[PDB]
Each structure stands twice: as C-alpha cells, then as structure tokens.
Amino acid sequence: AVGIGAVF
Amino acid sequence: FVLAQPPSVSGAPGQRVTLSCTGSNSNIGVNYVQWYQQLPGTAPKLLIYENNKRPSGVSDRFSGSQSGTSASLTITGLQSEDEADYYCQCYDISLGAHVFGSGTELTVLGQPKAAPSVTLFPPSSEELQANKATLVCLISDFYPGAVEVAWKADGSAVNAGVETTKPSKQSNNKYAASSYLSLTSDQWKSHKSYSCQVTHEGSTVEKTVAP
Amino acid sequence: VQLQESGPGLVKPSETLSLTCAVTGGSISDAYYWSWIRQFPGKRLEWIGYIYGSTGGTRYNPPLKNRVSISIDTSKNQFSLKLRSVTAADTAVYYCVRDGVATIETTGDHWGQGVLVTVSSASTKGPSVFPLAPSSRSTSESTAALGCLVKDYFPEPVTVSWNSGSLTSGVHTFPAVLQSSGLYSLSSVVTVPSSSLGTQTYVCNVNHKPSNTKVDKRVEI
C-alpha cells in the first residue's frame, strides 16, 4: 500500500 | 512497541546516517515497511512505502531497505532541515493491526550557538481595567534548547506568580519559550520597573518595562 | 485530494468521542482505505481502524473493536469515527488519512491536520484576549513587535492569525503554558515596521473552537 492500506 | 527503534541518532552535516527498525517474523519479516517523517507541529509525512519506494517530492537523499526482520531508513548528505522524528510502520499478523515504531529523534550536529531574542510586554490597559496585570516575556531563536528565566521587580527577585514554558523547537530548529508574571493592578502600579532575565549558555539577555 | 477533521473539543469520561472527516477533491466511494490514526501526548502513534470506500467494509485495531465504529456518509462525502466509553487514556490528536494513489509519481498518502480531543471532567472555559502594544522605547527602533495575549482557557488548542491571515511574515505564535490553576495561556506576536503604526491597522484573530468562540482584537497605539 502507498501508506496504510490493504495488508498485502 | 512491536517495532523497536533507537530513541536518538545524530549525524554531522553532509554525512550519511541510518535509522534502524527492528521487528519480528510477524511484521517486517513478511509485510511492507513504511517510513514517516514528522516535523514540529505537523502531521506525519510519508517518506518511504513498500520497503523502498519513494513518492514524488521526497528528496533522493532518502532511501529505504529491508532484510529479514529489520528495516532501515538511509539519509545521505545530511542537512539541518532533516531534523525531525522518524517512525517506521508495518502490519503485524499476530496482533492483526497496522503498527508504528517507537520513533527515532534525529539531531544534526555542529549547529552554531544562537542567543535568545527577547520581547517583554507590559500589561494591557484593558486587563488593568479588570484590576489585573500580566507581563509577557517572549523568547525565541536560541540554540541549544536550554534557557533559564528569572524575573526581578526593581532590584529584587520575584519568587511567586511566574509560569514559564519548556523550550520547544521551531521550524528553523532553534527554540522558543515564554514566561508570564501575573500581578494585580496594585502590584504593577507599586513598583518602578519589572525585568525579564533570560540566561542562555552562560550569558543573559534582560528586558525591562515600567508603569 | 484534501481531508479535514471536525472541530477540537472536550469529552467527559465515559462518554462517546465522535469525529467526522470531510473529503474534497475526490470521492469517499473510491477504492481507497480511510483510516483514523491518533497520536498521544508523548508522541506514540496508534492506528485505530479503516473503512474501504468502495464497500464500507471495516477493520479495527482488535483491542478497540468493542468500542469503535467507523462509517461513511455518501451524501456529505465524509467518513466518521465513534469511540465509546472514553477515558483520559484516549486524549490524543486524531488524524483522518487516506492511502495514496498507486502510480510511480504518487505524492504519498493524504493526512488531515489532526484534531485535539481531550477527555476530562474539567469544564470548558473560553479565553480573555488582550492586546500587547509595544512599550514606548520599542517603537523608537526600526521594527516593533505587537501581539495578543490569550489568557486562561481550557482545553487546548487555540489558533491565532493576523489581519485575517493576510499577515504572514514576522508572525510567531508561541506554545501555550499550562498554569497551576489548570488553565492555559499563550501569546502571538508579529514584528512590523515602526513607521507603519499610524497608517496600518493590526488585528489578531483568536479561535478557541472547544468553546465555539472567536475574537478579532484591534491592537491600538
């Protein structure tokens, strides 16, 4: 993720 | 803190420094690592994502790397405007959460000494109309971050009614503080002059105000 | 493109923290993750949870799952946080954040400005705002400093501008002091050319959102 997002 | 970071790391200007982030097989070992920079008063800013990618507008002196259960932020050509807090961030499978590191404070060494600039204000007329008087002593642009503030009324020390902030870092990496002497109208009118004395690296700058 | 949290404030212990983030420059329904992240005094960062714009699916930090709810409102293009049964441990700065576009020239993720929520049984109190006009000898110099004293408020924060934001250079707003009474004071000062004290008007704009109060104070001669 570009930051905090999908875990993988 | 599941991601352990050195609380403080320092470098000389122009040098290369590496900020470490130590994790486990349930986070850094398996999931992407992000790096955030936080300057005083501002939200965190993404410097690195997905272990080693850099967004547009982040200087190329910053670069990220990961191996095993450890990750690293690398700064080349170190500058004073790189002084900030740096956090690593990853996802932890066993906690099921996105987590932040404990944080590393980066100081750039060899910055020149700077004496505090000092402004002292008398009480406003309209605060005096409410029968009160606050003297305000504003202190800015000193380095390093330690200062001592003492008040005097005519000659003598004032030992009551003073509230003084801790120094806090400015955007330009120098420091600011302020100090408040709270009096009544009659106290203010009673003495001939009041003084704010600021001691910094063994010398003092003093300002005076009179009724 | 831009995220803005709702206003700062006081919450009584055991009650419910309720925040909203207004989004502009993009759709709350886009395929992005909308997070709440807080930073405590002491600087520790904690991820609270997120909601996915396209589906409304949520994930929460597991210790918080029984207390927290994140939601989306399409009509207002905004998302919200509710954290119940709050205690002094929940005093923190709360940020809304969205992950960044996945293209090579991405700017990164997008963070709001953060909103201070303080949990306390103490009562809210708005400030007195007093003008700081320079002593006589300072007007004799080439530049003069004038300012505003914002005295005896709770809780943090207060913001100061000068002349409605049309005066930037020379402005310095100092961090507040926490007094023994338990109340805050801060000062804002701007340095200006001494010649201008007759021509120009100087007004400082104090905003204390926790008590819904705003004061525009003229600094007189």
Q: Which amino acid is at C193?
A: P
| Spatial contact of B83 and B89, defined as CB atoms under 8 Å apart | no
**How far C132 CA lies from chain B's nearest CA (Å)?**
6
Question: Are B119 and C135 inside 8 Å of each other by CB?
Answer: no
Q: How many residues are given for chain B?
A: 211
**Residues of chain B with C-beta less than 8 angstroms from the C-beta of A8:** 31-32
Closest chain A CA to residue C52: A5
Dist CA C212 CA C9 (whole Å): 9
Integer Rg of chain A from CA: 5
Q: Which two tokens stand for residue B81?
A: 């405007």
Dist CA C94 CA C2 (whole Å): 16
Angle at C216 between CA C215 and CA C221, to 5 degrees: 130
Q: List phi, psi (to 5°) of C7.
A: -75, 150
The residues pairing with C93 across neighbouring beta strands, listed in sequence order, are C39, C116
Q: Which residues contact C106 (CB under 8 A, 6 or more apart)?
A: A2, B55, B56, C100
Question: Are B31 and A1 inside 8 Å of each other by CB?
Answer: no
Half-sphere exposure of B122 (CA within 13 A, CB side): 22
Greatest C-alpha distance within chain A = 12
Give the residue carrying structure tokens 């007329």: B125
Give the residue carrying structure tokens 């120094």: B167
Q: Tell me how far CA of residue C169 lies from CA of B159, B205, C27, C161, C173, in angstroms.
A: 36, 24, 36, 11, 12
Mind listing the domains of chain B with CATH numbers?
Answer: 8-108 (2.60.40.10), 117-209 (2.60.40.10)
Dist CA B143 CA B174 (whole Å): 5
Burial C179-205 (b: 16+ CB within 10 A, else e): eeeebbbbbbbbbbeeeebeeeebbbb
Q: What share of chain B is helix, strand, coil (3-state, %, to 5)?
A: 5, 50, 40
Q: A6 at the C interface (CB within 8 A)?
A: yes
Dist CA C148 CA C205 (whole Å): 9
| Spatial contact of C22 and C38, defined as CB atoms under 8 Å apart | no
- DSSP-derived letter for residue C90 is G
| Spatial contact of B18 and B72, defined as CB atoms under 8 Å apart | yes
| Spatial contact of C185 and C208, defined as CB atoms under 8 Å apart | no
Q: After which residues do gaps appear in chain B, with C to N over 2.5 Å?
A: none
Dist CA B86 CA C170 (whole Å): 29
Reference B176, options B8, B40, B42; nearest CA is B40
Mind listing the domains of chain C with CATH numbers?
Answer: 2-119 (2.60.40.10), 128-219 (2.60.40.10)
Q: How many residues are given for chain C?
A: 221
Say if residue B144 is preceded by a cis peptide, omega within 30 of 0: yes
Helix (H, G, I), strand (E, B) or coil at B189: helix
Q: Which residues contact C167 (CB under 8 A, 6 or more apart)?
A: C161, C190, C202
Interface test with A, best of C30, C99, C110, C111 (most A CBs within 10 A): C99
Question: Are A8 and B50 inside 8 Å of each other by CB?
Answer: no
Dist CA C49 CA C68 (whole Å): 8
- Asked whether the CA dihedral C71, C76, C78, C84 is positive or negative, the reply is negative
Helix (H, G, I), strand (E, B) or coil at C49: strand
Question: Are B55 and C100 inside 8 Å of each other by CB?
Answer: yes
**How far A7 CA lies from chain B's nearest CA (Å)?**
7
Half-sphere exposure of C62 (CA within 13 A, CB side): 7
Q: Pairing state of beta strands C110-111 and C92-98?
A: antiparallel
Q: Which residues contact C90 (CB under 8 A, 6 or more apart)?
A: C11, C17, C83, C117, C119
| Spatial contact of C174 and B176, defined as CB atoms under 8 Å apart | yes
Q: Hey, how many other C-beta atoms are within 10 angstroms of the C-beta on C212?
A: 11
Question: Are A3 and B46 inside 8 Å of each other by CB?
Answer: yes
The DSSP element (H or E) to which B187 belongs, if any, is: helix B185-190
Dist CA B85 CA B43 (whole Å): 11
Q: What share of chain C is helix, strand, coil (3-state, %, to 5)?
A: 10, 50, 40
| Spatial contact of C155 and C196, defined as CB atoms under 8 Å apart | no
| Spatial contact of B94 and B85, defined as CB atoms under 8 Å apart | no
Which residues of B make CB contacts under 8 Å with C? 43-46, 49, 55-58, 85, 87, 89, 95-100, 102-103, 119-124, 126-127, 134, 136, 138, 140, 163-165, 168, 176-180, 209-210
Q: A1 at the C interface (CB within 8 A)?
A: yes
